[PDB]
Design an enzyme around this catalytic site. Structure first.
Site, PDB file in Angstrom:
ATOM      1  N   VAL A   9       0.810  -1.220   0.000  1.00  0.00           N
ATOM      2  CA  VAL A   9       0.000   0.000   0.000  1.00  0.00           C
ATOM      3  C   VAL A   9       0.844   1.272   0.000  1.00  0.00           C
ATOM      4  CG1 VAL A   9      -2.280  -0.858   0.701  1.00  0.00           C
ATOM      5  CG2 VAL A   9      -0.525  -0.416   2.457  1.00  0.00           C
ATOM      6  N   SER A  52       9.008   0.274   1.856  1.00  0.00           N
ATOM      7  CA  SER A  52       7.678  -0.063   1.388  1.00  0.00           C
ATOM      8  C   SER A  52       6.812  -0.581   2.536  1.00  0.00           C
ATOM      9  CB  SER A  52       7.727  -1.033   0.204  1.00  0.00           C
ATOM     10  OG  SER A  52       8.733  -2.032   0.307  1.00  0.00           O
ATOM     11  N   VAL A  53       5.555  -0.135   2.560  1.00  0.00           N
ATOM     12  CA  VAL A  53       4.564  -0.428   3.600  1.00  0.00           C
ATOM     13  C   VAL A  53       3.545  -1.453   3.074  1.00  0.00           C
ATOM     14  CG1 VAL A  53       2.821   0.708   5.144  1.00  0.00           C
ATOM     15  CG2 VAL A  53       5.004   1.828   4.657  1.00  0.00           C
ATOM     16  N   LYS A  66       5.600  -1.818   8.032  1.00  0.00           N
ATOM     17  CA  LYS A  66       6.623  -1.123   7.266  1.00  0.00           C
ATOM     18  C   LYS A  66       7.931  -1.898   7.300  1.00  0.00           C
ATOM     19  CE  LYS A  66       8.727   3.472   7.490  1.00  0.00           C
ATOM     20  NZ  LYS A  66       8.370   4.884   7.825  1.00  0.00           N
ATOM     21  N   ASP A 125       4.648   9.786   9.344  1.00  0.00           N
ATOM     22  CA  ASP A 125       6.015  10.086   8.897  1.00  0.00           C
ATOM     23  C   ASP A 125       6.691  11.336   9.462  1.00  0.00           C
ATOM     24  OD1 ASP A 125       5.525   7.675   7.431  1.00  0.00           O
ATOM     25  OD2 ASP A 125       4.951   8.874   5.656  1.00  0.00           O
TER      26      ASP A 125
HETATM   27  C1  LIG Z   1       7.888   8.064  11.609  1.00  0.00           C
HETATM   28  N1  LIG Z   1       7.341   6.866  11.024  1.00  0.00           N
HETATM   29  C2  LIG Z   1       5.984   6.749  10.782  1.00  0.00           C
HETATM   30  O1  LIG Z   1       5.185   7.680  10.817  1.00  0.00           O
HETATM   31  C3  LIG Z   1       5.495   5.389  10.463  1.00  0.00           C
HETATM   32  C4  LIG Z   1       6.282   4.259  10.690  1.00  0.00           C
HETATM   33  C5  LIG Z   1       5.790   2.993  10.378  1.00  0.00           C
HETATM   34  C6  LIG Z   1       4.509   2.838   9.834  1.00  0.00           C
HETATM   35  C7  LIG Z   1       4.008   1.459   9.508  1.00  0.00           C
HETATM   36  C8  LIG Z   1       3.714   3.978   9.605  1.00  0.00           C
HETATM   37  N2  LIG Z   1       2.429   3.842   9.059  1.00  0.00           N
HETATM   38  C9  LIG Z   1       1.975   4.151   7.776  1.00  0.00           C
HETATM   39  N3  LIG Z   1       2.803   4.514   6.756  1.00  0.00           N
HETATM   40  C10 LIG Z   1       2.249   4.791   5.555  1.00  0.00           C
HETATM   41  N4  LIG Z   1       0.950   4.762   5.198  1.00  0.00           N
HETATM   42  C11 LIG Z   1       0.157   4.402   6.223  1.00  0.00           C
HETATM   43  C12 LIG Z   1       0.597   4.093   7.499  1.00  0.00           C
HETATM   44  C13 LIG Z   1      -0.572   3.783   8.210  1.00  0.00           C
HETATM   45  N5  LIG Z   1      -1.667   3.881   7.466  1.00  0.00           N
HETATM   46  N6  LIG Z   1      -1.225   4.265   6.235  1.00  0.00           N
HETATM   47  C14 LIG Z   1      -2.164   4.463   5.184  1.00  0.00           C
HETATM   48  C15 LIG Z   1      -3.152   3.490   4.956  1.00  0.00           C
HETATM   49  C16 LIG Z   1      -4.085   3.657   3.932  1.00  0.00           C
HETATM   50  C17 LIG Z   1      -4.045   4.791   3.128  1.00  0.00           C
HETATM   51  C18 LIG Z   1      -3.069   5.759   3.347  1.00  0.00           C
HETATM   52  C19 LIG Z   1      -2.129   5.599   4.370  1.00  0.00           C
HETATM   53  C20 LIG Z   1       4.212   5.250   9.919  1.00  0.00           C
END
Ligand SMILES: CNC(=O)c1ccc(C)c(Nc2ncnc3c2cnn3-c2ccccc2)c1
Length: 326
Positions: free
Chosen positions: A27, A28-29, A44, A158
């Site tokens: 959705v 690399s994550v 992630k 992030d």
């Molecule tokens: C400072 N590190 C962070 O902030 C951090 C570290 C590890 C993770 C796993 C994340 N989590 C996400 N990273 C990216 N997209 C995300 C999330 C959670 N939900 N979605 C998402 C879901 C659906 C649609 C759009 C977005 C953040």
């Protein structure tokens, strides 16, 4: 206590996660379904965490920030794991959080109404107030890292990492109030449904900002720190300050007033997150007893510039000490 792990190749890269998480979709994550709780989670997999001194530093920091952030509008750390059976075998880091539905990009990608904007923006500023009280600045706040579910429950994603994109970047960096700049820039787009500042290059970007904020005052021009920056403001024509009432046609007078205090080049006089929460436009949502600060974040590690292995060892240590939140 160590669980069994399992492997799979997703978009050219191998994922070694525990058994607990199934159906991984990039959705690399990854959007993974959790079997223990039976909920949808985001996992992630860190990009070469220890394949440079900087990636390693970035790596430790992110884990430190996540083992700390406990706010309803600041994504929290649910799980941290490593396929590693030992420190000597420690080369992969995984972080787990709740999945979200959409980022604030796709939400407007259809214009947003006033109470919709009030509640999205209130939350964005609510999360900063916490990030800010832990002596942290986001630096790259943009629609693609503000995430919401169906209920418009908001998460700041992030933060404290990263250092087309310039669109939301405060000009003095192109203090904490750099994300306030990004806020107002996001608030405008939600009210209209257009990018306020869609500039093509670093020169264009400033000309647009100045085309609306107005060329800096002779007081502010004396204040400016860069010779090349001052000498670039002079090189440019004298634009007046544009009446926001005429730019944001039909908005709640308090929304337009709010952005006036969000789009100010004086970085010392710009609205702070906490200040903005108390502003008239948020009254229905504002609760001073339910807008918390963060438990002191010890970030002494920042002044230290170690080698890959010293960072990796530290990143390993924090994966060990983890107690998942109930
Ligand atoms: C400072 N590190 C962070 O902030 C951090 C570290 C590890 C993770 C796993 C994340 N989590 C996400 N990273 C990216 N997209 C995300 C999330 C959670 N939900 N979605 C998402 C879901 C659906 C649609 C759009 C977005 C953040």
């Amino acid at each position: 206590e160590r669980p069994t792990f399992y492997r799979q190749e997703l978009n050219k890269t191998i994922w070694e996660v525990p058994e607990r998480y199934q159906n991984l979709s990039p959705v690399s994550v990854c959007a993974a379904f959790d079997t223990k709780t039976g909920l949808r989670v985001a996992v992630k997999k860190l990009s070469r965490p220890f394949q440079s001194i900087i990636h390693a530093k970035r790596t430790y920091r992110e884990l430190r920030l996540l083992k700390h952030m406990k706010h309803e509008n600041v994504i929290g750390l649910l799980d941290v794991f490593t396929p590693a059976r030992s420190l000597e075998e420690f080369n992969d880091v995984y972080l787990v959080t709740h999945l979200m539905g959409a980022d604030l990009n796709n939400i407007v990608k259809q214009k947003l109404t006033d109470d919709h904007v009030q509640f999205l923006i209130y939350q964005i500023l609510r999360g900063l107030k916490y990030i800010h009280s832990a002596d942290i600045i986001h630096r790259d706040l943009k629609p693609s890292n503000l995430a919401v579910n169906e209920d418009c429950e908001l998460k700041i994603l992030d933060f404290g990492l990263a250092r087309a994109t310039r669109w939301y970047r405060a000009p003095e960096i192109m203090n904490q109030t750099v994300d306030i700049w990004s806020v107002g820039c996001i608030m405008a787009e939600l009210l209209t449904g257009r990018t306020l500042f869609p500039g093509t290059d670093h020169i264009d970007q400033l000309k647009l900002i100045l085309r609306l904020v107005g060329t800096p005052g002779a007081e502010l021009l004396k204040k400016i720190s860069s010779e090349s920056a001052r000498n670039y403001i002079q090189s440019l024509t004298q634009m007046p300050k544009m009446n926001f009432a005429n730019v944001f046609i039909g908005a709640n007078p308090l929304a337009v007033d709010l952005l006036e205090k969000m789009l100010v080049l004086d970085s010392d006089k710009r609205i702070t997150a906490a200040q903005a929460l108390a502003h008239a436009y948020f009254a229905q949502y504002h609760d001073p007893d339910d807008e918390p600060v963060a438990d002191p974040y010890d970030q002494s590690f920042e002044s230290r510039d170690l080698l890959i292995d010293e960072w990796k060892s530290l990143t390993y240590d924090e994966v060990i000490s983890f107690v998942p939140p109930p």
